[PDB]
Design a binder for these strands. Sequence first.
RNA 1: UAAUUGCGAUAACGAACGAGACCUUAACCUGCUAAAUAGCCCGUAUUGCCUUGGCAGUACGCCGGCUUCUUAGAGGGACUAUCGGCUCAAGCCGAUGGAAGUUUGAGGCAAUAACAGGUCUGUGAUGCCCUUAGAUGUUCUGGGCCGCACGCGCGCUACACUGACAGAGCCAGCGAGUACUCCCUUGGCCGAGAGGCCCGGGUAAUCUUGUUAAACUCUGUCGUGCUGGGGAUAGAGCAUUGCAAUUAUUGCUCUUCAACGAGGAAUCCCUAGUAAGCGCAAGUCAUCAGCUUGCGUUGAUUACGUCCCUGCCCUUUGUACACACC
Lengths: 103, 142, 10, 199, 45, 138, 61, 92, 70, 69
Amino acid sequence: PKVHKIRITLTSRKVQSLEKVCQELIERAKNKDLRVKGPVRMPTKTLKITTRKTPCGEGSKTWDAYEMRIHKRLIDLTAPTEIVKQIIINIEAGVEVEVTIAA
Amino acid sequence: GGVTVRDVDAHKFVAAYAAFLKRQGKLPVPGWVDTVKTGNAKELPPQDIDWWYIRAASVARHVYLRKTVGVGRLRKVHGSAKNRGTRPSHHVDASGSVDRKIMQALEKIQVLEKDEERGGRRITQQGQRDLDRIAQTVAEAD
Amino acid sequence: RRGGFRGRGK
Amino acid sequence: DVLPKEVLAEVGSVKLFNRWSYDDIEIRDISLTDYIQIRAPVYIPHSAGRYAVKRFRKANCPIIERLTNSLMMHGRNNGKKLMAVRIVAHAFEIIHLMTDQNPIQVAVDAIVNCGPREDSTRIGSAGTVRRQAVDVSPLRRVNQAIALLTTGAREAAFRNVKTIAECLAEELINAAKGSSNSYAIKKKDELERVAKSNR
Amino acid sequence: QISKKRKFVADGVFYAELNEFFQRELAEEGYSGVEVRVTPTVTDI
Amino acid sequence: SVQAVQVFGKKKNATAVARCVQGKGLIKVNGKPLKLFAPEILRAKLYEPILILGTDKFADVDIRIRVAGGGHTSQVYAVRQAIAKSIVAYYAKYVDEHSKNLLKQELIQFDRSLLVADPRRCEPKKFGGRGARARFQK
Amino acid sequence: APVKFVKVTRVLGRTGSRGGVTQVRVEFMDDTTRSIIRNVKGPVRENDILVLLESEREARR
Amino acid sequence: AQCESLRYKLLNGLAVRRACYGVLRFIMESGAKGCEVVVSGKLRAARAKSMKFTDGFMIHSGQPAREFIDTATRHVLLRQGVLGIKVKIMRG
Amino acid sequence: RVRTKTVKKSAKVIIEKYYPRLTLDFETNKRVCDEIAVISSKRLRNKIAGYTTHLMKRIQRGPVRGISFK
Amino acid sequence: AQHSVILDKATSDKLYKDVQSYRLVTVATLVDRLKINGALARKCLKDLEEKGLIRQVVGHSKMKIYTRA
RNA sequence: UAAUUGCGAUAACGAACGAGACCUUAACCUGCUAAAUAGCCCGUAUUGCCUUGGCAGUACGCCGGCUUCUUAGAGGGACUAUCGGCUCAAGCCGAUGGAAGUUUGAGGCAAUAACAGGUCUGUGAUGCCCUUAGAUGUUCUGGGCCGCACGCGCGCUACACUGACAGAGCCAGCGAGUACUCCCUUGGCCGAGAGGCCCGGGUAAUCUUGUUAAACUCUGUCGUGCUGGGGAUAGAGCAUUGCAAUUAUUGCUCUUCAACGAGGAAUCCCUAGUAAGCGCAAGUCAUCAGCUUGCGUUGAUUACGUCCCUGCCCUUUGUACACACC
Ligand SMILES: [Mg+2]
Ligand SMILES: [Mg+2]
Ligand SMILES: [Mg+2]
Ligand SMILES: [Mg+2]
Ligand SMILES: [Mg+2]
Ligand SMILES: [Mg+2]
Ligand SMILES: [Mg+2]
């Protein structure tokens, strides 16, 4: 049983499901008497695309801007390698998780 | 009290350090003077004769304030606008050989040394003492 | 000299 | 120590502009006060005020700053207050040497004297003008006086060996009295003459 | 091994591919939208 | 322990963070003294918050400020805005406010902007600032 | 010329073809009883002071 | 789904109005507070026109039109040409 | 600055149903309205509290037609 | 229109008897009435400043002004 | 009243769209939850000057402490609150407090009925007609879409001293970046210049990047002359991209040194971080921005009105018009 100081990164477009995923994860880790590090607040990634609105070029000239936003909300922990497998279970749709042992 | 570079005006200080470097009068010159453009955007050489010495003094002044700097960074530090003709102007950098060699010569005068551990050139122990000594020469000159 | 259309009168 | 020895001279006395005082203001006429604001001195004209939000908010605003704004015109010189402020300071220094009186003493009399009192209004007459020769409000009077003074300097200095630093100074000293050889006076009396005709 | 920003567009196009194909195939069976859940080494529809 | 207070000032895009520590009457900006960091004609626009209050009230106060972002006039407006909060927070927190209230009233009657910032930024549009392109035949 | 000083006491709407002119009731500040009606080109507030070259002429309404 | 049901009923020989009318009743028993069906194309003439049928409530302006409204559109091929269908349903 | 019918109706019904528990102070009505009502907007809650506190200022000084409370 | 690039005795005598009565001396004044080039006017400011006849009021890289002593 | 927004009178009563509501974003939090891919205090080692006890820099700490400054979550905050002078009411005007008092600012979405408006050259959306093996399908070579006595539009650089040139001083924000093949690029060396070679970092708050941009500031040269303002036109030479550069793709050096003195009748845009001045990022892209979409720096004069011209809305009124004053 050797601690490896794991760190896991998350990504999603919506914010409430991701927040409640971390919100439920934190008590599952604190109650086991595990040293937990806070939910750091990463910058939001905003993406925009501009294209001509009309499909033929006739009439007046007007533009529209589509957009998309992404958040990470990464969290890390100090724990052995096998214990973290059972602590990241029961995740809902949309949110993808990537694990890094950081050994 | 004690003074340093930050305590003196930049314009008169660099002129004073150029006058001090007059008295030593020993910096190699590969003959580039009176022929170079000092920058692609530019068109005329500097009028004053010792531009090679005033520029080196200012370069040693700013390296005293910066932790790591290279030729690429100074390339755009000394660049300016260029009259492209009837098109709108832009920003382009100065000449590379002049700025590279004017500070390549400045290491062997024992002012600053190489920084191969991470890159660039940094100031040396006794090198900073040269720019420090002229601070007292100017401070009570008031 | 000038066109007479556009229904301008007198 | 932390302050320059120059400003240490003025810190002991009452607050004023370092080079020139704001005391001993003219007693010459009325109806121009309450619209020229001199009760609050300022060191440099430059300030990021809120004077362009309401109707008469600009009435309580330093006149010198108004001159600085009007000094920068004709496309190229927009927003260059650093360039304008030196010009105003230099003009105030230049006018001091040709006359021992205070430079603001001359400038104030220049503005209070170079303001037109009548103007011609445009009333339609189906191709003709029924100019009724109405009077001019004091705020509009100072507004046009500033414009005439600044445009005189720009026109005179255009394509001439002289510089705007003293070009601005010479109208102010000329306009202090009834010199009648200035551009501003040419327009002020010309406008009054046409109002007299169009009464 | 691709960046997250391009990943979030690629999987969106993957959803578009599934959605567009299903109109052209299962229109008779009263198709009305889908939703995809991605899991490691196995996916469900 | 050591007496100190931290304040900040803002401009369009100029942030000027300041630290006021009980010292001996030394004032330096960005490390360098006040002789250097400003344009020459605007050098007047830095010293008024000091002179209007008096040097005698700066007996044992030291201020260090770091400023970045914006433009030349933005830094001098940010640092001049930061000075008022540094001096009023240090006096309010650490000494009797009998001084503080007279300083605050006297300074704000000269200029209200010393304690509050002026919000001004740009507005996006699909033709430029506020003007459209030229029209052919109206 | 005997130029006279007058002060405005009340503003009564904005007249004129283009709204430049305003019609006001003025007070002569030398005989407080007297009051007439005049027209002004620029912005006017209450208690403003105007300079009048000739007073006999009167405006419409 | 109703849009496909309408497409199938109109693809087989049937009056356009009867197919559209049946949808409004089929919507109403489910509990929708309003509905709207739009049909466009060549209505038995050389010139083309369109018809709209509406019942219940309706919204057009705010972003609630983006979620509270379910919309769909389909194209149907006939012997002579193409007909367009648009259906909107608001669910509470 | 004119208030629409939704606020007019909500203010009248709240005032006539619950007269005594709320007073001329705007701050109190701000917390009174949202506890005893289901409102989906914060500014709209402010709209109701601001107009509703205006009514009791003029009711306190003479009755007004169109409003009746217990 | 054209000015003089060289300074002779016919113009030299004008200085040492007129600048004692001038209230202001500038490049514009010299190019105006002395009919001399601007470069020579600038030379005249610096050569005569050290002779102890005019005093500095304000100094600048674009315009300089001098007065009586 | 910005509004069929309301107060109310009422042969009408009660309802459905639009407006508002609503959503994103820009402004306030020394209060909550926090953070080595963001900072501060503190502690060590170490450097210089006064030497003081100090001032200005370096490298380290990973449970030494903290989150004001950077960041995004949960919430609070403006409601016209208070006051004065009008009115029965809706409302309007001024002042104080307050980050904020035009609906706080700017946007997204946005009704019925319509146009012989545009698009078959976006679509494996499509009726009918036509050519379908001497093909209007597909494919390969070369040329053209840019060819010039002339009239018209959207822009760029200027006609200079409120300028040009030369040294020095030195301040942003929004964004982009590595494949089954090299994408943004630090550092070192060579090279007048454009470029070339060699280690290395970054699938990215970690590296490029503090993108230390331009304008601007200080000190000098030139001196009103279409001159050192202005750079059209053309000759010679050196390079990168690509299969291919001639009618040069573009870049650099020397030389050639045109027109242009604020512009007629006419005419466009605009109300505060707004106009104008100046640059940066992205799009098309192997290379080329004088184009467009956004971002930031410096930052103004005058009005707070009216229906006179060119137009819009409601009511009364006239008509020989209904393809509707063309
Ligand atoms: Mg609605
Ligand atoms: Mg709306
Ligand atoms: Mg509409
Ligand atoms: Mg020439
Ligand atoms: Mg590009
Ligand atoms: Mg008739
Ligand atoms: Mg009729």
